[PDB]
Amino acid sequence: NNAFCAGFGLSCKWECWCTAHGTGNELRYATAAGCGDHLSKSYYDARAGHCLFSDDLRNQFYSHCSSLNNNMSCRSLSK
């Protein structure tokens, strides 16, 4: 849900991050720049350097990583 996800990083349904073209390396700073305060209802997890959300904000996050010339990878948090 949005309350617990954006608030504590709990009950989130998606975990996404920007990745570098060519190497596929995770890019924490690019990820942070489009998460938390930059994307309503998202939760930036500084330990993993990943962006989490309950609502499906993949389109919005995709646009962000792309604007920086990066790719995006997401994990569905499936039960």
Curated annotation (Swiss-Prot):
<protein>
    <recommendedName>
        <fullName>KP6 killer toxin subunit alpha</fullName>
    </recommendedName>
</protein>
<feature type="glycosylation site" description="N-linked (GlcNAc...) asparagine; by host">
    <location>
        <position position="71"/>
    </location>
</feature>
<feature type="disulfide bond">
    <location>
        <begin position="5"/>
        <end position="12"/>
    </location>
</feature>
<feature type="disulfide bond">
    <location>
        <begin position="18"/>
        <end position="65"/>
    </location>
</feature>
<feature type="disulfide bond">
    <location>
        <begin position="35"/>
        <end position="51"/>
    </location>
</feature>
<feature type="disulfide bond">
    <location>
        <begin position="16"/>
        <end position="74"/>
    </location>
</feature>
